[PDB]
Paper text:
Some Staphylococcus aureus phages encode dimeric instead of trimeric Duts, which are completely unrelated at both sequence and structural levels. The crystal structure of the ϕDI Dut described here represents the first structural characterization of this group of dimeric Duts, revealing particular features. Remarkably for unrelated proteins, our results indicate the de-repression mechanism used by dimeric and trimeric Duts is conceptually identical, involving dUTP as a second messenger turning off Stl-Dut interaction.
The structure of the ϕDI Dut in complex with dUPNPP (non-hydrolysable analog of dUTP) and Mg2+ was solved by SAD to 2.1 Å resolution. The structure showed 4 molecules in the asymmetric unit organized as two independent homodimers with identical conformation (RMSD of 0.32 Å for the superimposition of the dimers). In ϕDI, the mobile domain is reduced to the first (α1) and the last (α8) α–helices due to the shortened C-terminal region, and adopts a “closed” conformation approaching the dUPNPP. ϕDI dimerization is mediated by the reciprocal helix–helix interaction of helices α2 and α6 from each protomer in the rigid domain, and is further stabilized at the tips of this interface by the loops connecting helices α1-α2 and α2-α3. The ϕDI dimer has two active centers with each one occupied by a molecule of dUPNPP and two Mg2+ ions. Both active centers are placed at the same face of the dimer and are connected, forming a long groove delimited by helices α1, α2, α3, and α8, the latch, and the loop α1-α2. Helix α8 conserves some of the characteristic dUTP-interacting positions of motif V, mainly the Asn (Asn158) that anchors the deoxyribose and the two interactions with phosphates mediated by Lys154 and Arg161. These contacts are partly recovered by novel interactions specific to the S. aureus phagic Duts, provided by Asn45 or Lys59 from the neighbouring protomer, which are not included in any of the previously defined conserved motifs. Surprisingly, in phagic dimeric Duts, the His is substituted by an Ala (Ala73 in ϕDI). This substitution expands the sugar binding pocket, lowering the steric restrictions for accommodating other nucleotides as substrate, explaining the observed dCTPase and dITPase activity showed by some allelic forms.
Residue numbers in the entry:
A (entry chain A): 1 to 160
B (entry chain C): 1 to 164
Amino acid sequence: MTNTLTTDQLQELLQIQKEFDDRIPTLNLGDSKIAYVVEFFEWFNTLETFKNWKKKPGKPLDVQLDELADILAFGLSIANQQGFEEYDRDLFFESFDEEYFLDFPYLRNQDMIYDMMSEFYDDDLTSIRRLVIVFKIAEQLYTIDQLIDAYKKKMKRNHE
Amino acid sequence: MTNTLTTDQLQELLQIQKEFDDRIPTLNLGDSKIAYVVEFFEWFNTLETFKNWKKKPGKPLDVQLDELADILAFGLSIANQQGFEEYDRDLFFESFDEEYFLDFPYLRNQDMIYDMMSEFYDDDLTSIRRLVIVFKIAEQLYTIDQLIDAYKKKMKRNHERQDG
Ligand SMILES: O=c1ccn([C@H]2C[C@H](O)[C@@H](COP(=O)(O)NP(=O)(O)OP(=O)(O)O)O2)c(=O)[nH]1
Ligand SMILES: O=c1ccn([C@H]2C[C@H](O)[C@@H](COP(=O)(O)NP(=O)(O)OP(=O)(O)O)O2)c(=O)[nH]1
Ligand SMILES: [Mg+2]
Ligand SMILES: [Mg+2]
Ligand SMILES: [Mg+2]
Ligand SMILES: [Mg+2]
């Protein structure tokens, strides 16, 4: 069952993020939104689907998951900063369950980056959507469990 | 060594890039365009204008210039792959000379990244424009000379990659 997300897991992740962000008095929503986008590209660079010049493209899994965990962190951070109640959690699991286009072949296509950019400059981009994106990448390319594991490791390192 | 770019310097850069890209039989325009965008973000990440949580934000200058050089390389690559004649060179220097918005305060504002993204998703984005962007960053935040220096170093290293 290593590739499903429960409401308890999501709430624990939000709490872990909140306790870290509590240490950062400059915490700023505009910056965290920019940070999400930059981390997304850092992650996309580890995937290397556009790097036709590599003999063996793709950085190591742990490196890919570490970068994916940085996206989650800002996604969780934006969620907490905006306020993320039960109704928001409900809508997240409904959006996740109803997402049919963010699958493996789509996410492996280097051109997906343009679609993502379009969503990233849209000022209506929601905190729910940002989380759906990162969790669907985890579900389809990795597992949710591996993302959560990598996130917990990274957050411990971030605390030091 | 003047923070200016001449037509001879630009033509040398294009020739350096062509000779490297000649070694890459999978050379692909869509991939190079994607690569330009990715390297732009790798470079923006070294600037750290959005990273309010850092005691001392901004990676070292050599790191920042190295990443800036990777953008130049794909910009030069896209130029050569599309064809870059005299008329293209003429129009580049006119665009560069006529660019008044891409200055230091604008480029230091984290929010510029959204403007850049909009330009990057536009399929009408030109090879000239991509070069204007990277050379204005060099001019305003660094010097053109430092970019060229960093690009030449990086291309030597890149030749050694394909060597082994
Ligand atoms: O407000 C914040 C800021 C940072 N962080 C954490 C999340 C993420 O794991 C990490 C990202 O911070 P940096 O971008 O500064 N370090 P990174 O490991 O990404 O290296 P680089 O900056 O070289 O890409 O810090 C937060 O959780 N909240
Ligand atoms: O067609 C090409 C391919 C690569 N290059 C050069 C430009 C740039 O300096 C470098 C980019 O390739 P990589 O992304 O593999 N090197 P980097 O260490 O920057 O990548 P990463 O940080 O993702 O490991 O190789 C070209 O000039 N033309
Ligand atoms: Mg980072
Ligand atoms: Mg990162
Ligand atoms: Mg790179
Ligand atoms: Mg690079």
